[PDB]
Symmetry: C3
Subunit: 428 residues, 3 copies
């Protein structure tokens, strides 16, 4: 299948990304829980007591019950207001981390895809080698029979061939376990997928460095979080400072209050005391609180938040310096990836002409078999190296985009025009 | 000492494991703390105080002393029962982590043990390669003495010999460190270890791909945990919801209360209601509390607990996906391992192109030394590959059992039979 | 600039070390927050309530305001004293974290610097391996047209040359990436860096491994913090069992409160009138509290604390077990590094003499270019390694200082002498 079909059937079925969503959804959900202390609170209370102790002055037994609707409404708290802003501040950061975890999923699917893709290429070339030197191995054990080739050359040929049996083995395994990186970031066994078309290939020169660096130090997801995180630490210098500010609360209630009286000293009593008191209530009130001095606590908390700000500040410096080098580094990687293909292709023909001339030398008996087996292995390496440079450019293209922050569907779309022929993924 | 003796010494002492033990013993003990708020709560407290006539209170100033036994008891506080369940679940997860860690100690002890043995093989084979090159250098010198060998041949030999001395250096340094590795797991230095006896090396395949996948879905330790934690998230919804329910509480007091007055004792129009009041009471009242509208707070948390559940459900698929691509991965690996032993077992056989052919013809003047050297590396470049591949097998059996979660003390009892020959860790 | 200078530029500008500082500075500042509950706690408050009649209250309303000046002063409370002790010990463990971070920068700088120096050497030599084989190619094709026909083996020399272009390619890149690397840590691009002076280069044996070990055990910073943390655990045991102790308090407050009544009850008396009650009071009081039983909470708290202390002890074992294995590695690593310098040192003079003889031979026609290229390749390999070995040495020399925890500017000044000849960080 096409890349944008492996990823397509993977982005909606990705167990990490969705958890990142459920994290953001909960982070946004409590935007209400942080608001709730700024709304009227209402409860229903009901008590029943049984008093029974006795006098050295008072005494007497009683039975009281009660019920009420209490209400509270904050008027000027600020810290309750502050906790609301912080929860808004903190959900934005959690929304960027999701936008970041969206970013990552692209790469990992692409990377795991090409992991499998050039895993074939290696096993494919090891199969191409293991047989191209089976031609050399066969004819030589017949050229030996004519007596033209020594009793020693064949022995060396057989041993070099066996150490290609081993390479082929740990090239199958490399293809298998690569499929087992894709069956995770995707959750699918793909029996075939689109190989990159060899001649349908054009290496476009990466856009200039300083232009990429400016664009990134604005739309990059990593310093955005670090900036929003300096915002969070900043509003916390304010949160600590609220511990000086006064507070104003409103109460309103409607209660009932019954009483009864038991035993002796209650029966046959004088006046109002045994009297069963059955009354209720309607209250409305205002409470005001202002801290004068407390151990220098709220002081300490401010400096603490200030230092925490210096921190989150330097943490941005780390985040900026990181991006500073992610663009340069991958820009060097996409440049070098150009020169690499333009060098390894040159070495494919150079190793090629050297090979066929050795087979011409193996003919007419002017050259050895151990000499042509050097010619073959140095050819197939040049090819293998050529394959890698192609994939490293593709992967470093995404990186240079992803460092900017601008990695999306469209970047992954323009890469379907490059690939074509569907290749097998089974090491049989 | 052998693998079981070395392992069992590690079990006793290993600080990583015993920490992981305390972390579980503490967590289990926390059940008692989490249960405490359900049992009776018995406090006590005295309370002296002194009043003053600041305005109309003039000439009325009190001093009252009071003591009291205070008892509270929960009769249906739902959130408290939930706290106990949550903590039992908390300790359930914590016992499973401790189990994983037991698995980890085993895999580590063996991993580190089969480093020392491999280090010994790279050393052996290097100084075997070293001592062999010295033979062919020796007889080349004395052939050059009698003018049969061009100086380049000797210059070449001595060059290759000098690399091998440099290799014989890094080979000893590795073994030196690999000992120090074994000691920071185990706690002891080992003057000798039982090496792999190659004569009776069994290489029987594994159980089919599916038999493991099944077995590693009932028995596997890291998945069992992702289950237990999705459970914990469920039980946490239940917890959140309990913010709606009413709470009922039994209370009981009994305490003295002695006041006295003195100031403008008595003037007029009142009565001596300022007599030395010596109170005693004996309360046993139970009370009820139910919340109506709490600012939409309790629902946010119900929604959040649900979003957090979806997330805990997400990372259960993630854990499952891990499990597949660890059994499948570890299966492929044990295949390539056995498959590799064969390939490298013949590669060593065919590498006796060095044996005859090269060594033979060199001694009778036929083959050039440079070529005889290239043979006498290829053989040893296969000797190491073989022994290395064998120890890769022995820790791919163990790797599967880790995925199956059945990895235990028994599986070492197997591998201790494979060993036999006591070889020293600090040769020469 | 030089190693010493690059550090001074990074010391003041590094975002990581400066963030560490902020974390330490906050920690120390917290000792004030922790101390604050032991000091007086002054607070002003004000109320207003309107009560309205219901049943037996029907026809009685009230308007009451009050204003007080409250103060709380803890007399005896071990927990509040324990909180302060703990915060200080917290700040201490933070301080050792900071000291550790100071070191990591030093070690990290050196690594990045000698990586730029190593990428120079790797490139500088690749070009000298490229230029040697270009002469090789030129001063061969001159003879090829005329004399000894090289149709089969001048194409091999051309393929040889093409791979050393793809090699110099990668080399060019590993210099850029290694500089951006140095930048991140230092916040500087460097055109010039002081390189190692081979003439000036000596090697000094390390102090005996036992002297080192003893020295580490007494001032290694990881072990120091490990001991501090185990102390924290112990003190947290005491903190738990402070639950058993009583809490003697003091509260002083001077207040003002007045109630004015309204409704169907304005004929009667409380004293001279049953209406106005403007009054104030001055209060001072002690407040004894003592828990007697509470679900066995405190008992389990101490059991947890104790178990948790076992983990701190086990962690202290892990630390020591580590410092042992680190110190002994750092020792092994340095001795092997000297022993390697010596080996590769001879490996060049050997490789030179081999090539010297090969150049001379081929110069007459007694040797082939295939052999003169192989000989040139192995000379630059040895020169590569030798360069690499000395740079490694210096690192292992700092590593050992880092293991016994004494690494500082002094050590970075030491190496400054061995550097001198300034090299460009990109000639192209
Ligand atoms: Cl304050
Ligand atoms: Cl609600
Ligand atoms: Cl208790
Ligand atoms: Cl110790």
């Amino acid at each position: 299948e096409n890349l944008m079909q492996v990823y397509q059937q993977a982005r909606l079925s990705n167990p990490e990304l969705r958890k990142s969503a459920a994290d953001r959804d909960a982070a946004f959900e409590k935007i209400n829980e942080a608001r709730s202390p700024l709304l009227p609170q209402l409860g229903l209370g009901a008590d029943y007591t049984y008093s029974n102790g006795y006098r050295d002055a008072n005494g007497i037994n009683s039975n009281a019950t009660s019920a009420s609707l209490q209400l509270t409404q904050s008027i000027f708290d600020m810290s309750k207001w502050r906790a609301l802003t912080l929860q808004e501040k903190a959900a934005g950061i959690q929304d960027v981390t999701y936008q970041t975890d969206q970013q990552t999923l692209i790469l990992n699917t692409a990377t795991a895809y090409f992991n499998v893709l050039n895993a074939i290429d290696v096993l494919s070339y090891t199969q191409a080698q293991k047989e191209a030197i089976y031609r050399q191995l066969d004819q030589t054990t017949q050229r030996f029979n004519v007596g033209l080739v020594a009793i020693t050359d064949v022995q060396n040929a057989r041993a070099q061939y066996d150490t290609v049996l081993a390479n082929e083995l740990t090239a199958r395994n490399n293809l298998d376990n690569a499929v087992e990186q894709l069956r995770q970031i995707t959750g699918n066994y793909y029996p075939e997928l689109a190989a990159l078309n060899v001649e349908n290939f054009k290496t476009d020169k990466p856009q200039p460095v300083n232009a990429l660096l400016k664009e990134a130090e604005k739309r990059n997801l990593s310093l955005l979080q670090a900036r929003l995180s300096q915002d969070l630490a900043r509003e916390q210098i304010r949160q600590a400072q609220d511990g000086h500010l006064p507070t104003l609360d409103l109460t309103a209630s409607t209660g009932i209050s019954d009483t009864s009286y038991s035993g002796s000293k209650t029966r046959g009593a004088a006046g109002t005391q045994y009297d069963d008191s059955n009354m209720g209530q309607n209250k409305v009130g205002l409470s005001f609180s202002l801290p004068i001095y407390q151990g220098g606590m709220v002081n300490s908390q401010v400096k603490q938040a200030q230092y925490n700000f210096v921190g989150a500040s330097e943490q941005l410096e780390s985040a900026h310096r990181s991006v500073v080098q992610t663009v340069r580094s991958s820009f060097n990687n996409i440049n070098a990836s150009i020169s690499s293909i333009n060098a390894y292709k040159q070495a494919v023909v150079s190793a090629q002409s050297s090979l066929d001339a050795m087979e011409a030398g193996f003919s007419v008996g002017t050259e050895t078999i151990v000499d042509v087996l050097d010619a073959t292995t140095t050819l197939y390496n040049a090819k293998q190296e050529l394959a890698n440079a192609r994939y490293n450019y593709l992967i470093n293209q995404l990186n240079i985009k992803s460092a900017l922050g601008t990695l999306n569907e469209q970047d992954l779309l323009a890469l379907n025009n490059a690939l074509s022929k569907p290749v097998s993924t089974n090491p049989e």
